Structures are given as C-alpha cells and as structure tokens.
Design a protein around this nucleic acid. Structure first.
Lengths: 48, 49, 158
DNA sequence: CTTGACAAAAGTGTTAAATTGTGCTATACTGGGAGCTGTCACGGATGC
C-alpha cells in the first residue's frame, strides 16, 4: 500500500516481483535447465 | 538472507525513484522494480560458491 | 457524497467502480474511507471521506456529456509551450489532474499536430495516453466496451 | 587460332534513403558512499 503523508489517501497496489526459483522434490533446484544444488554452509554462530 | 539484501537494493529502487517526480501519478505499480531483486536472487543460485 | 456502488473515476490510474466505506487503521483513531475498486487491475484503494471531492476523487461524466468531449477532440485545441521540456511537462500535468474536458482538449491540439506538421516520440506517447483514458471513461459512461468508445473517437476524425 | 555479335559480368555516375553527429532544454536543484572480518612468515620503512 502506497500512502501519502499529506492527503492521507491510501492507494493500494499489488505488484509482480519476478521469477524466483522454487525447490524441486528431492531438494535440488533447476537453474538454467540444469539440476543444481545448494550445499549447506557453516560458520561460528552469532553472539558473544 | 539474499532476499533481504537484494530487496534492500530494490529498496534503493523505491526510495530514490519516488522522489524525482510528481506525487500526482503514483503507485507501487510504477515505483516497484524487478532486476535488483530478481537478479540478486538469480545471482545467489549460480555464481555463489 | 460517495455512495456504495457509485460508479466514479479515481485518477490518474483510470476508470473503475468504488466500493463502500471502511475503517482502515491510519495514525490515530480510524477514519472512514471509501474502498474504491477498479476494473482490470486487481488492487484496492482507500480514499479519505474527509475531502474526497478535492483530493482528486471525482465523478464520472454523464452519458449526456459525451458530445462536448468528442467535440473537444474533433475541433478542440489549446496552447502548448515552445521548448520541448515545458511541453512534455504540461502534457504530463493534464495527464495527472484527471479533468476530462482538459485532457480531451490537450489531446485535441496534440492530435491536430500529429496529422499536420508531425509529432515527436514523446508528445505522441502522452497523446495516446490521453486517447486511452478518454476511451476508458467514455466506455464507463456510455456502458460500452472500449472498442465502441475508441470508435466514437475514430468517428470524430476517421 | 580468328571476326563479328551479344549475353552477362562488371564499371561508373548520380541520388534517394539511412545513419550518425551536434546543440540545447531556464523554478530550483550547490561536500560521495559502502561497508568486513577465523592466518602466516619475513623484509623494509617508519614511528618511538
């Protein structure tokens, strides 16, 4: 929703972001027609 | 995460575009972009390690 | 002022039909709004009931106010800036306000130019914008599809 | 191997249509911008 600060007139619009790759069955995405995979990453957990 | 930062690039694509102009004709229809977001996420799934 | 099912246009976006009164949470205590709908694009709208007539939410031309607009097309004209910048500016402005008479007039002198001296790739884009919006509200008032409205406009000229 | 005839390939002259290069737009716009990490060893210039 696009709301003007002045007129206080709410103008609501739905838009289209784009095409985001979705996960297949076994858990391997298909990018550029080729079956690919995202390997898990690891790092020291945030904190003190 | 990549959605967060990429959509922040799109946020640049929002806050900057909505002031060059006339508030008269205005709506996220013309204010919303794609390539920053869509290509950010397109970038995560390929060129990333 | 605006009743539930009043068929009116909410410029610049285009024609549509409103729907009703709502309380949408904005700032402090919820103020009444007109939920206003639109035909093709699926998005809602909320127009403040405070001063909806001065905010740019206006009525739709009656079925009897068509010939004045068609005449503002066929023979209609208006002064336009010399420098291309200011010309584009004014075209955009009239394409903002939503005033049907004004837009028809602008489209009149602009169209008059397209058929005579020529038209740029800018002024013509705005011109087509005008003709399309005209097609929208002339379709809404006369209860006809956009074909017959655009055919009224093509009747003005040929 | 030779002469004339002649079709096409090729040469040249002149234009129409396209491509490309230039200048300017006047309300007022007047000091960016984005972040990143979990070595290690030694050699040299430099600040103590």
């Amino acid at each position: 929703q696009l709301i003007h600060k002045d007129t206080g007139l709410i103008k609501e619009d739905e838009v289209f972001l784009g095409h985001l790759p979705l996960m297949t069955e076994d858990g391997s995405f298909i990018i550029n027609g080729a079956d690919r995979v995202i390997v898990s990453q690891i790092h020291r957990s945030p904190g003190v | 995460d990549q959605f967060r930062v990429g959509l922040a690039r799109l946020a640049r694509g929002v806050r900057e575009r909505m002031v060059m102009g006339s508030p008269d004709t205005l709506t996220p229809a013309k204010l919303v972009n794609s390539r920053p977001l869509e290509a950010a996420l397109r970038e995560f799934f390929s060129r990333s390690q | 002022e605006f009743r539930p099912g009043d068929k009116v246009v909410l410029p610049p976006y285009g024609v549509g039909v409103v729907a009703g009164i709502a309380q949408r949470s904005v700032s402090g205590v919820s103020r009444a709004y007109y939920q206003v709908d639109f035909p093709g694009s699926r998005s809602k709208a909320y127009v403040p009931v405070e001063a909806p007539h001065s905010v740019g939410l206006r009525k739709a031309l009656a079925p009897e106010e068509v010939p004045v607009i068609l005449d503002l097309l066929k023979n209609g004209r208006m002064p336009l800036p010399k420098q291309w910048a200011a010309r584009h500016r004014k075209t955009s402005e009239i394409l903002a306000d939503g005033n049907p008479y004004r837009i028809a007039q602008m489209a009149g002198q602009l169209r008059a130019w397209e058929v005579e001296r020529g038209l740029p790739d800018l002024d013509r884009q705005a011109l087509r914008r005008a003709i399309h919006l005209l097609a929208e509200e002339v379709a809404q008032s006369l209860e006809i599809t956009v074909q017959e409205a655009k055919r009224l406009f093509e009747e003005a000229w040929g």
